[PDB]
Ligand SMILES: NC(=O)c1ccc[n+]([C@@H]2O[C@H](COP(=O)([O-])OP(=O)(O)OC[C@H]3O[C@@H](n4cnc5c(N)ncnc54)[C@H](OP(=O)(O)O)[C@@H]3O)[C@@H](O)[C@H]2O)c1
């Protein structure tokens with residue numbers, strides 16, 4: 001039969017998973033599980049909308065639960081909770097807390113005999129796999145990760161907090177010259193300041209002083225003061241017209257040398273019109289591998305490092321060798 | 326204790342494994358096995374050089390045997406042979422022939438209980454993994470593979486068989502415009518002539534006829550033949566540089582364009598491939614420790630088994 005999927009949480013990732021399901025005909029969406037009153041939440045797919053408290057009664061109805069909650073607060077609770085009852089996938093993205101989150105999920109999943117793949121997505125996720133592949137294939141070398149262009153919600157909210165700002169969108173952008181230095185094999189040391197520029201689109205409150213606001217943004221400790229920062233004062237119409245998308249991506253580059261001195265460059269990049277749609281497409285693919293692992297009697301927390309790529313595909317191992325190898 | 330590696334075949338890849346072992350201090354190179362008289366093959370590492378007939382006797386001395394032979398010429402026999410006695414890695418590159426190769430290796434390795442990872446390298450290998458990932462994450466879209474600019478080792482050796490060719494080096498070269506159309510998200514339709522050019526640098530035998538040699542070379546790609554001196558071929562055409570691109574251009578179910586690109590730029594094609602074989606050798610050793618057997622492809626190898634670092638350390642440092 002089809003692999004049965006549940007969504008927990010109906011935000012951008014949640015919508016992204018519904019859409020990915022449409023691209024993965026071996027998968028069926030069963031229900032969306034929300035913390036909000038379900039009588040009140042509409043979902044584009046028109047499947048059953050249920051409160052998170054009904055989820056346990058769906059244990060025999062759902063093969064993999066895709067957890068589409070936020071990393072700061074939603075996932076720390078929801079990851080361990082849902083891994084008690086289902087195989088799970090999530091996008092947990094706070095790198096520093098990965099080890100603690102893994103341990104928490106793992107406990108749950110080992111107790112339940114379920115597979116929980118944590119931290120799926122471009123970063124962590126696909127960029128991670130490329131960092132790892134780079135260092136093993138080219139052990140003598142340096143890796144550089146660049147992020148964006150994409151919105152930084154934390155920088156956008158810091159701008160919004162400035163008196164005289166009505167609304168704002170801030171973007172992190174890789175610096176092309178630095179990308180190019182890395183591709184050349186020079187192997188400089190590059191900080192985050194050397195790798196990215198910042199660009200801010202800002203709507204003033206009526207009568208606000210643009211010099212003062214731009215001063216407060218460019219001098220803000222931690223957030224902007226040490227980074228090449230451009231500030232554009234624009235209208236709400238412009239922000240709505242041109243800054244409503246959630247584009248994202250960046251680069252992963254390993255520059256290394258053979259033992260004889262040969263420069264070898266590995267470059268992996270992403271250019272995404274939609275961050276959530278891309279992340280969620282990845283989540284569904286991993287869901288297929290968590291289903292497979294579960295059917296083989298596996299259990300416990302996993303990451304992208306533990307998942308053979310063949311299990312991501314609906315194609316037979318034989319057909320993969322024939323078509324893609 | 327160290328992972329004990331054996332090399333089978335002292336050619337470009339074999340020198341390349343030697344070099345890659347220097348970079349992987351968890352591994353020790355035990356011996357080079359050759360079909361040539363071992364007294365006549367000098368190896369850079371100065372490890373023991375032995376004839377392939379003595380390999381079976383080293384069954385308990387070697388954890389992974391890295392098979393550095395030619396895909397058409399030596400691997401079809403060597404791969405199944407060695408997989409009777411050792412965990413093996415090889416670089417078998419002939420895509421059309423991988424199913425048969427895989428079944429022949431697979432039947433030896435299943436019977437012996439060894440792990441054999443076949444077809445490890447940039448393509449097949451890393452490019453393959455990117456083609457799979459692109460289709461799995463972006464099911465609606467197109468995948469485009471480009472090779473070069475780099476020396477085509479196979480084509481170069483094919484031109485050297487033509488009468489009146491003293492020597493030659495052929496290049497495969499991706500057409501920049503095609504790569505750029507693909508990157509734009511145009512999803513271009515491209516013929517093979519629109520993706521790659523072929524460029525041959527040929528040194529004629531004293532006496533030969535250019536027009537006859539060119540005809541023989543050219544008679545589906547735009548292929549430019551340059552007749553040059555031995556000196557120019559040495560100065561400017563010495564390297565085995567290679568590389569290429571795997572791009573997946575797709576769309577979300579709502580129409581958003583999503584592009585994934587993987588690329589390589591390699592000063593040494595053999596050195597690179599061999600660095601990959603050694604990483605896989607580590608994974609084969611790990612699968613062997615875990616009770617695994619049979620033939621595997623890159624598709625079957627989780628990336629964490631490639632690293633000498635613990636799973637916990639990987640999660641802390643790289644994820
Ligand atoms: N690994 C990666 O590369 C990667 C990439 C992108 C994102 N991510 C992660 O994905 C996480 C979620 O991203 P997202 O953009 O989906 O966040 P989001 O849109 O804010 O959704 C998060 C949660 O917010 C709740 N929510 C949605 N709409 C709401 C509303 N109108 N009122 C109140 N609550 C609402 C939902 O839970 P309920 O339905 O239960 O209310 C949803 O599960 C991020 O925190 C990020 O860490 C990871």
Ligand SMILES: NC(=O)c1ccc[n+]([C@@H]2O[C@H](COP(=O)([O-])OP(=O)(O)OC[C@H]3O[C@@H](n4cnc5c(N)ncnc54)[C@H](OP(=O)(O)O)[C@@H]3O)[C@@H](O)[C@H]2O)c1
Pocket residue numbers: 333334335336337338339358359360361393394395396397399416417418419444445446447448449450478594595598
């Ligand atoms: N998967 C990929 O991405 C990828 C990339 C690159 C290459 N490859 C594969 O790698 C294969 C091996 O390539 P290579 O460049 O190492 O080939 P090579 O240099 O031609 O060596 C092949 C064999 O030739 C024998 N040999 C070496 N020097 C010799 C000499 N002077 N006289 C007689 N015999 C000699 C050696 O075995 P003995 O020591 O037993 O004589 C060696 O194993 C190619 O066929 C290609 O398909 C794969």
